[PDB]
UniProtKB/Swiss-Prot annotation:
It is a multi-pass membrane protein. InterPro entries: Na/ntran_symport, Na/ntran_symport_taurine, SNS_sf. It comes from Homo sapiens (Human). Changing G361V: In HTRDC; decreased taurine transport activity; does not affect protein abundance; does not affect cell membrane localization. Glycans are attached at N125, N141, N152. This is Sodium- and chloride-dependent taurine transporter. The lineage of its organism: Eukaryota, Metazoa, Chordata, Craniata, Vertebrata. It catalyses: 4-aminobutanoate(out) + chloride(out) + 2 Na(+)(out) = 4-aminobutanoate(in) + chloride(in) + 2 Na(+)(in); taurine(out) + chloride(out) + 2 Na(+)(out) = taurine(in) + chloride(in) + 2 Na(+)(in); beta-alanine(out) + chloride(out) + 2 Na(+)(out) = beta-alanine(in) + chloride(in) + 2 Na(+)(in); hypotaurine(out) + chloride(out) + 2 Na(+)(out) = hypotaurine(in) + chloride(in) + 2 Na(+)(in).
C-alpha cells in the first residue's frame, strides 16, 4: 500500500542519526575497547569500518530504497530463497530490544539517585559501601594508602555500581531476588517506549533539533572536563597506542567487527526500513556516508572522554589504567559519574548526563522497536490492521520484552546481560547475517547489477569502493573471524574473573544459534515447500520474485 515518505531531507537524516547514535557509541565502544586493550581494538574497528561497516550500512539503505519494503519483505524481492536473512534480523532485534532497554533502566535509576544533596557515588559513608571502601583522594594520599595496607579496597563509584545499582550476586547460577527498584525503572522506560511508539514518531520531529543537540553538547562538556582533569594524557595514550600482540588474538577482531555492526545497527534490519521510507531519487549515498562519519566520530570522541577520566582515576587510585574499572558494561556507569563528581555543581551536571543517556538510548530504542513492529506487521498486514490486534501488538511485544527483561534486573542479572550482549546482537550472529546479505547482493543479485540500480536512484555511478566490499572484503572478514572463534575458542568471562558455567555458555550459543539458524532453516523450508526438480526449484527461487 502507501509507504510513508520522510518530509524534505532532514526527517530522514535525523531519524538515521537517532538510530545509530546512542548507547552503542557512549556505553559499548568504551567497554569493548577497555576489555581489549586500547588501540589493539582500534585497528580492527577501523579496518571493519571502511571495509565492511560503511558499505553494508549503505547497502541496507539502498535495498530499502529500491525494494520500498521492510527488512523482511525486502529480501523476498531481491533473493526469494534467502528470505532467512530478514527473519534472522527480526530475532536479532527482539533480543537486542530486551537487553538494550536495561542499560537505559540503569540510567533511570541513576537519575533518581542523582537528585540529592550529596551524590551517592561520591563517598563511602553510605550503607551499601563495604568496609573495603576508600575515597580516591584518600588513596592518592601517601599517608592513607601507601603507608597503611588496605587489601582489595574499591572506589565508591565502583561499589555503588556493583552493590547498589546491580546488587551483583556471586554468579549467574543464583539469580537472587528481583530488584524492585530497578524493575520499576525498567517499567518506566518501557512505558515511555510503548507510549511514544503508540503515538508514533511524528511528535518527536518538531523538537528533535534540540533533543539531538543536547547529547552532543553534554558529551562535549564531558570531553572538555576529562582532558582538563589531570592524568588525562596517560588515558589518551592507552587509548591511542596499539598493542600488536593483542591483534594476534582472535577475540579483539570479533568484538571490533561486531561493534561496527552493532553501532551502525547493520543486520538488525532497522536500517533497511528507514531506507524504505526514503524516496527513490535521493542521494542517500552522500547522506549516509556523511551520517556514518558522525557515528564513528562520536564513538571516537566519547572514547577520548572516557579514557581521559580513566587516566585521572588511575592517577588518584594508583592502580594501572587497565585495572581501574570494570572491564565490562559497567565502564560507562563507572567512569562518567566520576567525571561528574569532579565537575563544579556536580548534582546539576549528573542530572544532565543521565538525561543525555536516556535521550540517546531511547531514540535508538524507538527506532529498533518500530522496525520490529513494522516488519512483523509486514508479514500479515491485512490481518493485523482490520483487527484491533495490531493496535495491541505493540503492547504485546513490550509486555513480553519486559517479562524477559526481568531476568536481567535480578541480583544476578548482569551475568545474564553480559551473556546476552556478547551472544545476541553481537558475536557471530551479526557476522553470520552480514556475510549472508553481502553474499546474496554481490554474488546472486549481482553487485555490478545493483550499481546500475543505485546509479539510477542517486543519479550517478557509485565509486567501485562498495562493490568490492560486498563481494570480497566483507565476506572474507566475516568468515575468517567466525572461523577463528571456532578454531581458538575462549568462553566468555565477566570482568575477567567469572568463569561462566558450561550450561550458560551453551545457553548463550542458543541465543546466537537461533538467529543464525534462521537463514539455513528457511533455505531448507523454502526449498521443501516449492515443488519441482531441485535444480529447477533453486533457480526459480534464486531469481528475484
Ligand atoms: Cl561506533
Amino acid at each position: 500500500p502507501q509507504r510513508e515518505k520522510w518530509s524534505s531531507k532532514i526527517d530522514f537524516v535525523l531519524s538515521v542519526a537517532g538510530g545509530f547514535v546512542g548507547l552503542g557509541n557512549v556505553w559499548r565502544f568504551p567497554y569493548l575497547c577497555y576489555k581489549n586493550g586500547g588501540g589493539a581494538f582500534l585497528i580492527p574497528y577501523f579496518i571493519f569500518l571502511f571495509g565492511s561497516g560503511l558499505p553494508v550500512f549503505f547497502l541496507e539503505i539502498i535495498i530499502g530504497q529500491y525494494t520500498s519494503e521492510g527488512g523482511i519483505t525486502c529480501w523476498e524481492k531481491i533473493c526469494p530463497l534467502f528470505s532467512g536473512i530478514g527473519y534472522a534480523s527480526v530475532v536479532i532485534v527482539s533480543l537486542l530490544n530486551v537487553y538494550y532497554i536495561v542499560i537505559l533502566a540503569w540510567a533511570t535509576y541513576y537519575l533518581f539517585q542523582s537528585f540529592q544533596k550529596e551524590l551517592p557515588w561520591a563517598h563511602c559513608n553510605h550503607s551499601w559501601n563495604t568496609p573495603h571502601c576508600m575515597e580516591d583522594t584518600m588513596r592518592k594520599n601517601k599517608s592513607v594508602w601507601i603507608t597503611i595496607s588496605s587489601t582489595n579496597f574499591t572506589s565508591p563509584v565502583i561499589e555503588f555500581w556493583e552493590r547498589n545499582v546491580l546488587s551483583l550476586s556471586p554468579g549467574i547460577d543464583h539469580p537472587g531476588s528481583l530488584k524492585w527498584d530497578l524493575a520499576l525503572c525498567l517499567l518506566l522506560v518501557w512505558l515511555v517506549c510503548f507510549f511514544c511508539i503508540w503515538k508514533g514518531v511524528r511528535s518527536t520531529g518538531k523538537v528533535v533539533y534540540f533533543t539531538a543537540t543536547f547529547p552532543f553538547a553534554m558529551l562535549l562538556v564531558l570531553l572538555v572536563r576529562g582532558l582538563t582533569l589531570p592524568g588525562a594524557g596517560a588515558g589518551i595514550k592507552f587509548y591511542l597506542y596499539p598493542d600488536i600482540t593483542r591483534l594476534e588474538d582472535p577475540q579483539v577482531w570479533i568484538d571490533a567487527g561486531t561493534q561496527i555492526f552493532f553501532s551502525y545497527a547493520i543486520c538488525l534490519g532497522a536500517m533497511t526500513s528507514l531506507g524504505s521510507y526514503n524516496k527513490y531519487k535521493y542521494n542517500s549515498y552522500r547522506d549516509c556516508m556523511l551520517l556514518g562519519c558522525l557515528n564513528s566520530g562520536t564513538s571516537f570522541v566519547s572514547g577520548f572522554a572516557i579514557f581521559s577520566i580513566l587516566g585521572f582515576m588511575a592517577q588518584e587510585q594508583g592502580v594501572d589504567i587497565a585495572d581501574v574499572a570494570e572491564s565490562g558494561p559497567g565502564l560507562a556507569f563507572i567512569a562518567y559519574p566520576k567525571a561528574v563528581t569532579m565537575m563544579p555543581l556536580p548534582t546539576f551536571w549528573s542530572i544532565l548526563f543521565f538525561i543525555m543517556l536516556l535521550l540517546l538510548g531511547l531514540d535508538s530504542q524507538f527506532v529498533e522497536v518500530e522496525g520490529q513492529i513494522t516488519s512483523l506487521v509486514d508479514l500479515y498486514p491485512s490481518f493485523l490492521r482490520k483487527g484491533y490486534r495490531r493496535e495491541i501488538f505493540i503492547a504485546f511485544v513490550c509486555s513480553i520484552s519486559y517479562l524477559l527483561g526481568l531476568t536481567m534486573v535480578t541480583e544476578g542479572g548482569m551475568y545474564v546481560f553480559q551473556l546476552f550482549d556478547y551472544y545476541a546482537a553481537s558475536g557471530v550472529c551479526l557476522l553470520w547475517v552480514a556475510f549472508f546479505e553481502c553474499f546474496v547482493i554481490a554474488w546472486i543479485y549481482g553487485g555490478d547489477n545493483l550499481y546500475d540500480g543505485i546509479e539510477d536512484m542517486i543519479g550517478y555511478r557509485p565509486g567501485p569502493w562498495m562493490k568490492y566490499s560486498w563481494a570480497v572484503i566483507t565476506p572474507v572478514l566475516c568468515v575468517g573471524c567466525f572461523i577463528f572463534s571456532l578454531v581458538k575458542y575462549v568462553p566468555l568471562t565477566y570482568n575477567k574473573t567469572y568463569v561462566y558455567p558450561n550450561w550458560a555458555i551453551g545457553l548463550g550459543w542458543s541465543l546466537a544459534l537461533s538467529s543464525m539458524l534462521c537463514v539455513p532453516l528457511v533455505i531448507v523450508i523454502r526449498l521443501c515447500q516449492t515443488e519441482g526438480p531441485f535444480l529447477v526449484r533453486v533457480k526459480y527461487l534464486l531469481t528475484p520474485r
